[PDB]
GROMACS .gro file of C-alpha atoms in nm:
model
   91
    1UNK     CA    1  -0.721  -2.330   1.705
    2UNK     CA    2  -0.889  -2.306   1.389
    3UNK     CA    3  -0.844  -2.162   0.985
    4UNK     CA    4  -1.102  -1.993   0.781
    5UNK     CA    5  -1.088  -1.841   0.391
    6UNK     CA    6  -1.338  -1.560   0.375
    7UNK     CA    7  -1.455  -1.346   0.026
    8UNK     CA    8  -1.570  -0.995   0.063
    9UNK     CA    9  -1.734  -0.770  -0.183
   10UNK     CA   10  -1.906  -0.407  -0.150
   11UNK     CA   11  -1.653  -0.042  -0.170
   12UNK     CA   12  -1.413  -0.281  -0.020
   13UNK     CA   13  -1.156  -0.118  -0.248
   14UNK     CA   14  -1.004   0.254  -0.267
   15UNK     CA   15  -1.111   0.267   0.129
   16UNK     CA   16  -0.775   0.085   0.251
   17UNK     CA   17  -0.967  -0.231   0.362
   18UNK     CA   18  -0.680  -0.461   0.303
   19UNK     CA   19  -0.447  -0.261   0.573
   20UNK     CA   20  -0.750  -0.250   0.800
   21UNK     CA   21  -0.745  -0.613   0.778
   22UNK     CA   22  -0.410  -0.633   0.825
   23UNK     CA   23  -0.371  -0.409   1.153
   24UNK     CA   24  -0.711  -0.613   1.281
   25UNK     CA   25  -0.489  -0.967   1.225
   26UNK     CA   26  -0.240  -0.817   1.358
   27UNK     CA   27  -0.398  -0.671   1.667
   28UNK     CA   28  -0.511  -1.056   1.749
   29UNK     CA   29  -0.157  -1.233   1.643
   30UNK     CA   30  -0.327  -1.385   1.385
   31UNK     CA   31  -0.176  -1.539   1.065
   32UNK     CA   32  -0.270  -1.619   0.709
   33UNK     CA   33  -0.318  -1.323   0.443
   34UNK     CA   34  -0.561  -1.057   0.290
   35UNK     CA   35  -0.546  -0.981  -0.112
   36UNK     CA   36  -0.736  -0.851  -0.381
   37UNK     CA   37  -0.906  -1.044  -0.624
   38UNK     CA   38  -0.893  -0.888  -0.991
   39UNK     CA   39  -1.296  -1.024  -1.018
   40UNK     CA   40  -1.392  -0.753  -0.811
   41UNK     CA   41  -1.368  -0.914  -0.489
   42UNK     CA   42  -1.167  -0.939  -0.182
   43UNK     CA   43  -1.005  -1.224   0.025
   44UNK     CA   44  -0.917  -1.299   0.377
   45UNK     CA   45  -0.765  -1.602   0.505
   46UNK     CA   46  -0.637  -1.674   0.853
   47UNK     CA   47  -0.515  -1.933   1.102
   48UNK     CA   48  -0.576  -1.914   1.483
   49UNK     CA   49  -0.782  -1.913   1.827
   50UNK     CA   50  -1.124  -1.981   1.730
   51UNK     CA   51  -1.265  -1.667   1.957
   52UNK     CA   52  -0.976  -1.425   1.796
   53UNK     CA   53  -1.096  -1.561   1.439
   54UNK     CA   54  -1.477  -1.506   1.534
   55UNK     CA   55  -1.384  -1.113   1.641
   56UNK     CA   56  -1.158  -1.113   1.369
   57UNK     CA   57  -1.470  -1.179   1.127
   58UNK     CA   58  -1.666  -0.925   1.305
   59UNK     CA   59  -1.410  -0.676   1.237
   60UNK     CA   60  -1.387  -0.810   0.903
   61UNK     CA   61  -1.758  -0.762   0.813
   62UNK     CA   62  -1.764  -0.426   0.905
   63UNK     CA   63  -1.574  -0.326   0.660
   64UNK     CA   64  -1.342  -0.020   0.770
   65UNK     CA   65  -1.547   0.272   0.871
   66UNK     CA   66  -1.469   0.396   0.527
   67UNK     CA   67  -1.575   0.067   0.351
   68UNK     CA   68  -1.954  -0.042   0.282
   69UNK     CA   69  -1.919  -0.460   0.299
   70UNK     CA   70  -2.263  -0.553   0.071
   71UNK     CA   71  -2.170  -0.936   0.082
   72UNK     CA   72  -1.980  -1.159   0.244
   73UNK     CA   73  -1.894  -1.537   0.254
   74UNK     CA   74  -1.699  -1.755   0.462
   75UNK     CA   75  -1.533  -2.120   0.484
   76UNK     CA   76  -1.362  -2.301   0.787
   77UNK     CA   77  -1.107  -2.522   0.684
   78UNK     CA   78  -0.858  -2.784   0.924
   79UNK     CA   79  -0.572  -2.779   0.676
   80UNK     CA   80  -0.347  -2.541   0.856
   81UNK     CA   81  -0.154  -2.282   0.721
   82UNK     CA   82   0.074  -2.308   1.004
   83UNK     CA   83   0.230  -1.970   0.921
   84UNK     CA   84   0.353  -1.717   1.146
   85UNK     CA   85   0.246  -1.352   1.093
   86UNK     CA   86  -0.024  -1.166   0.864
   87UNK     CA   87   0.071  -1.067   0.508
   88UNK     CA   88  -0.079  -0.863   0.244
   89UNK     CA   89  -0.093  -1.060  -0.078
   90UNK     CA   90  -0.226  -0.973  -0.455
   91UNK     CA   91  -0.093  -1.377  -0.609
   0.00000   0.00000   0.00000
């Protein structure tokens, strides 16, 4: 088990990135959130199996198909969230 916070920043925005986030947390069980950040960027942040968190940053840096990531920076942390299902966020 581990937690990350990730940024993101390219057309991540008017592409639906944050519900292909959501739909790729959810397809690993994953919990934590995704928001927007009213600099410019994006957020992730997510709790759970190491491997699903790893796939879940290669879907992440991908962007969706309709996104272009053009940056992209990332942070483990063991300070759990200990939360129990994905959210879309914009606190």
């Amino acid at each position: 088990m581990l937690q990350y916070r990730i940024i993101v920043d390219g057309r991540v925005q008017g592409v639906g990135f944050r519900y292909f986030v959501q739909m790729e947390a959810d397809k690993r069980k994953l919990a934590g959130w995704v928001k927007n950040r009213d600099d410019g960027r994006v957020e992730i942040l997510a709790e759970g199996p190491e491997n699903a968190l790893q796939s879940f940053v290669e879907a992440v840096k991908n962007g969706s198909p309709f996104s272009k990531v053009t940056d992209i920076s990332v942070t483990e942390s063991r300070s759990l969230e200990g939360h129990h299902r994905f959210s879309i966020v914009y606190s």
